[PDB]
Design a protein around this nucleic acid. Structure first.
Ligand SMILES: [Ca+2]
Length: 299
RNA sequence: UCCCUUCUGUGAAGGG
């Protein structure tokens, strides 16, 4: 029974060659092409080719779900929606300049291991920030602290029938470390609100420039876990009942899911020829589906 | 990115 093997091989290679026609006035987005190139390049004969290709398919299915969601998303209302989410968590981003200055003041207060009550921390920062930023208030600054709180940046030490005492955990006693956990927390709030936001836009939102794209990219990369693919599918699937699904993206669901149940972890077992074929058929289907949606059902 | 108060908040309670 090695004819089955060869025919699986042939069908897989056919799938990849068929998607290769998209390369390349290209219909596909800038990253999607990239992932496609990585997919065309796996040599399926080679075992590193089969496992790589398998995960390249899972990845390409990832980006397909993302892009599809990005259509269903209002670009002008993106930042308003983000900041809306942030304020809904009792947090607030005061803007890049002020936020940087505020975080540094928090650090000025707490890098040497000091423990302060929340009230006193807020007061410290307000008193020192209002001279350069007249806007500053206990309310708004309290919102910045609450953002660091929700980030689990504090060792909080309770005092019976009194205010708690807060210390910066030692791993966060430098501006770099702190600003990373801060920013990462904002990114998470973006994710729980279901918003997709490109690294360039993140650099814009949090820094007022474009020189922080790789940093943000790293944050988004570190937040990535396998389980997200499936629930992102979930998100899209309920976004399609707010639509009635005119383009019938629903037809993609079973392939997307097959792609989702692929294990992307290394040392995960190599695929059988029938898994290789089913996976590459699935990806061929969904990328075609993406292109159909973009070109034929947009605005 | 309405604003401000209060609070021990992975957040609540109220004002303009
Ligand atoms: Ca008391």
């Amino acid at each position: 029974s090695g004819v089955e093997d060869t025919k699986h091989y042939e069908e897989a290679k056919k799938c990849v060659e068929e998607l290769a026609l998209y390369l390349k006035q290209s219909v596909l987005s800038r990253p999607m092409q990239r992932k496609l190139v990585t997919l065309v390049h796996c040599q399926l004969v080679e075992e590193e080719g089969r496992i790589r290709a398998m995960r390249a398919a899972r990845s390409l299915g990832e980006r397909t779900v993302t892009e599809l969601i990005l259509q269903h998303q209002n670009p002008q209302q993106l930042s308003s929606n983000l900041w809306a989410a942030v304020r809904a968590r009792g947090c607030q981003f005061l803007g890049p300049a002020m936020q940087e200055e505020a975080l540094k003041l928090v650090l000025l207060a707490l890098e040497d291991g000091s423990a302060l009550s929340r009230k006193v921390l807020v007061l410290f920062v307000v008193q020192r920030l209002e001279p350069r930023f007249p806007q500053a208030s206990k309310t708004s600054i309290g919102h910045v602290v609450q953002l660091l709180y929700r980030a689990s940046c504090f060792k909080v030490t309770k005092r019976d029938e009194d205010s708690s005492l807060m210390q910066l955990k030692e791993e966060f006693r430098t501006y770099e470390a702190l600003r990373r956990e801060h920013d990462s927390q904002i990114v998470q709030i973006a994710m729980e609100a279901g918003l997709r936001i490109a690294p360039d836009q993140w650099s814009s939102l949090l820094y007022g420039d474009q020189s922080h794209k790789s940093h943000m990219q790293s944050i988004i990369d570190k937040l990535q876990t396998p389980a997200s693919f499936a629930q992102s599918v979930q998100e899209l699937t309920i976004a399609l009942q707010r639509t009635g699904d005119p383009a019938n993206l629903n037809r993609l669901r079973p392939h997307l899911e097959l792609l989702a149940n692929i294990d992307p972890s290394p040392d995960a077992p190599p695929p059988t020829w029938e898994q290789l074929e089913n996976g590459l058929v699935a990806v061929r289907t969904v990328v075609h589906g993406l292109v159909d949606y973009i070109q034929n059902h947009s605005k």
